[PDB]
Chain length 124, copies 4
């Protein structure tokens, strides 16, 4: 993939969260996520997909990934999905939006899902 080199590596969000990922040539994202916020301790497995043949009009590369917030330290009974685009060049960034869904009883389902945005850069 074209941005397999630019994607693979270590990324930091605005809050201090760290994302390490390897971009496969087929389009896989594999890695670990470590949150600066929430009911999270240490690293959690991340799996994802990216467009491995983007357009060539200076358009970004579409990707997305999931982290379920269970590891050998803790279980928040929740999962976050990040949807977004990788932009490369001088100040590469992954700009995302996300949905964090918690497992709830039916009664509480209406309030199961938070939404937000995250920008990741190669430096922080």
């Amino acid at each position: 993939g074209r941005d397999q080199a630019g994607i693979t590596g270590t990324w930091y969000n605005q809050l201090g969260s760290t994302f390490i990922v390897t971009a496969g040539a087929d389009g896989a994202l594999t890695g670990t996520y470590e949150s600066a916020v929430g009911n999270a301790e240490s690293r959690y497995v991340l799996t994802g997909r990216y467009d491995s043949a983007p357009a060539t009009d200076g358009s970004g590369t579409a990707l997305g990934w999931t982290v379920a917030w269970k590891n050998n330290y803790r279980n928040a009974h929740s999962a976050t999905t990040w949807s977004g685009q990788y932009v490369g060049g001088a100040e590469a960034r992954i700009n995302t939006q996300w949905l964090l869904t918690s497992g709830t009883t039916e009664a509480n389902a209406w309030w199961s899902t938070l939404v937000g945005h995250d920008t990741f850069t190669k430096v922080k």
Copy 2:
């Protein structure tokens, strides 16, 4: 094994007739394929995701999510959909999701890059 690995592993159908075949792994992995029924999509695309392999036993649903990049060997729509939701098991087993579809865009068009919606998957055709 995961508590809902057997419940989750299988074929799922949403309200639009899109179909998703997933294997739940013991660790929390979800792997499989998605066939969309709407938009710039043709045949099967790879899906990868994660689920809570040890959910609450208070009768809460099981948190999960998965991602489809809309490239396969026949088409590329330059976009990706992430589904975030939860699995409820039983006779009327379902997966309730909210989703995000991001297209690759220029910076001028970034502001309108991401669609939002909701899908409900059941084990039967709608």
Copy 3:
């Protein structure tokens, strides 16, 4: 306003909430919302906008409204916006997605905002 009549009146969500609205010829939505879930006691003011000259190809009518969850009896320090479209006809619906934002500290901002959907109908489910 084309769907001014079809929009005006009482609507119900699948969760037993009710919304009463008057659609003005100007594209105003005015009315009140009465909850069935959340820190929500009784009636709350609603204000919003609708497209008063829709397309004529069988497309819906875009609209949105806000409720700040403060009335004379309770205050949840939060607000919901509903963005959606009105579809009229035999089985008239208003299909929405919404954002519920709570007032927070900067520390807790990242989890200020919940997201969901609701479908409103003219008949009480």
Copy 4:
């Protein structure tokens, strides 16, 4: 306490859209929005609500407003609702998440809604 004066005024988002708004004592927001992107020309009416009695623990003031993209110059068959919170003081700002829905056929309904986020400050941007 009441941020009527704080909220009331001229705001600009990161893309140079302008938002003139008057907060009322009853929790009303009224004014105009002029966009810098999309099918928009000049000013559109906005109406909304804010919490007229917010917490006193450093919390922001929850708010929300709507613009239907119809005026005497253009009709884009859509509406945007912003949901967010006002924070006063230095770097007084309104942080929002937004949903933009267009009227569609039932066939195109799955992709009727865009999502994003906007931050408004009183300083017009670059």
